[PDB]
């Protein structure tokens, strides 16, 4: 099982007890967006990230009273239809909001039990995705598929390094393709222990297929209140991309000289086959619409890996 | 009985009947649908060889002027990209797409693929989070029926088509409509089954490699290529990978008898086999722009993946 989180008097995490860190409930988010939780029926805002005034423009404790019906009149009915009670936590709905102060905001919502989790990020206001799709499909074998996938993603994103990281049957990792900027260490061909991506992370990544750390030196922003009023318990944040990254993994990234990290799960036959794993040397917030392109490529690659491995075997 | 293709009509081949359906060489009709234009060019020199007879209307140029230039002169910014995207020996399924600002005809969508030493260039006029929301909705559908229903409803909302069907093949190649979204007043095809010969063997083979085809207007006359044969080979120009390809007259007749003015389908391919089609009808003629068709192409791949995932749970 998991330990209690740090904010509920749980022990500090070390290399001895990696597997037991409750990474899904850090009680905090990354500072490049804002997060609100809300009741499923009433639409009453229960928790907010302390930075919410920056993004939303409203005052701190005035939001706590209001309902989503009031705040988001046009979207609140769509949210009720899109995310009905009993739907999975993996199901997400997105909209673009013309907010007065902050301009265009991306809104991403999902449901966990009776709670709606709302994420707000800045956002902007072509054929590279279609061209990529056809390129992946005409790759003659798994090796070429891997090369095309890493190169495509680097071209779409500008990331300093993009790797395809394949899990062996014992969860040992191997870098089987790599696209990188000139003047970086090559990780191509190297292998890494299973504990670098511990079992609870692997399980989470089988269900929610994208996660990132935008800035490996940025401080997390707590939720207020930290605990969910409904349950007096931790708010599950595993399906929230804004979730704070495990401090252990943030230290690991800094030791590698990485300023920004992102990965996308490749899932084949219900199992985590591998990751499209990205690094940038400097901090880097990839905008939500470009992340959606990588999410699409995750599904396409999942399909193409099966197709290609049927030819291998 | 599987039998090889007849020569096309323009090489003295016989007229097609219900007795010889399967032998129609549907891939080499020598003609296109009138809502776009098509050019062929030599893959190394870029010399323009064939053009649809309507090419002047779309490109705003004299045919003799078009044919007297290379693609290097005609498309100075695209030509190097084409060469890089479509290297010699690449499969004919591989497509490169770009948007052009053409003075006489506004924004054109350019779609290119390579067959041997020939480049085939298709030109069509072109012009928020629905796809992402659809992706997650499809993945959360609890079983195969719910997946089929969400998929048909989603395609109908995106396109406005009068009818959208999920058409599933049985092992004997008969087909059945297993879900549909339809306009009010249309009679249901749900549960109906159809013979294998309605989608003959050469079409099914073609539809396993090239995953989208359409007939924008079921009464429109086809536009010949000029010249009709490829000058490189003095043989027919393969058009199986061109969406502008003229549709079999036999299928056009079938659609007119049903009261269908526009038709479109997307292949659902599972384990290298044609599992089914997303099949769409409109009562009036209807041109879906290339960027909206790309959304349906993505959905085709997602559905292929999800059908495999849902059927694995059904065991
Ligand atoms: C005591 C536990 C340890 C630990 C924990 C840990 N690791 C992750 C997540 C990731 N680790 C990754 C590992 C690599 N990245 C690379 O670039 C390479 C090789 C060149 C490796 C082996 C990756 C890719 C992830 C996923 C996240 C990402 O893409 O950045 C977590 C979970 C983090 C989270 O989601 O909150 C945890 C708890 N890592 C260790 O090395 C030991 C000390
Ligand atoms: C003598 C040959 C015949 C024949 C040939 C034929 N049919 C197609 C293509 C299609 N037929 C389809 C059939 C149906 N559409 C429906 O809506 C229903 C039922 C409600 C059925 C059974 C479909 C979906 C296609 C695919 C194209 C499309 O989506 O419109 C071809 C190939 C056409 C081409 O690609 O050029 C051919 C040669 N059909 C017959 O019925 C017999 C007379």
Author numbering:
A (entry chain A): 7 to 131, 137 to 324
B (entry chain B): 4 to 130, 137 to 324
Share the article's original sentences.
Light is detected by a bilin chromophore, which is covalently linked to the photosensory core of the protein, comprising of PAS (Per/Arndt/Sim), GAF (cGMP phosphodiesterase/adenyl cyclase/FhlA) and PHY (phytochrome-specific) domains. Important for the signaling is a stretch of amino acids in the PHY domain, called the PHY-tongue, which changes from a β-sheet in Pr into an α-helix in Pfr state The chromophore connects to the PHY-tongue via a strictly conserved aspartatic acid, which is expected to play a crucial role in signal transduction.
Two propionate side chains additionally anchor the chromophore non-covalently to the protein. The A-ring is covalently attached to the protein backbone in phytochromes, which renders complete isomerization impossible, but is sufficiently flexible to accommodate the proposed changes.
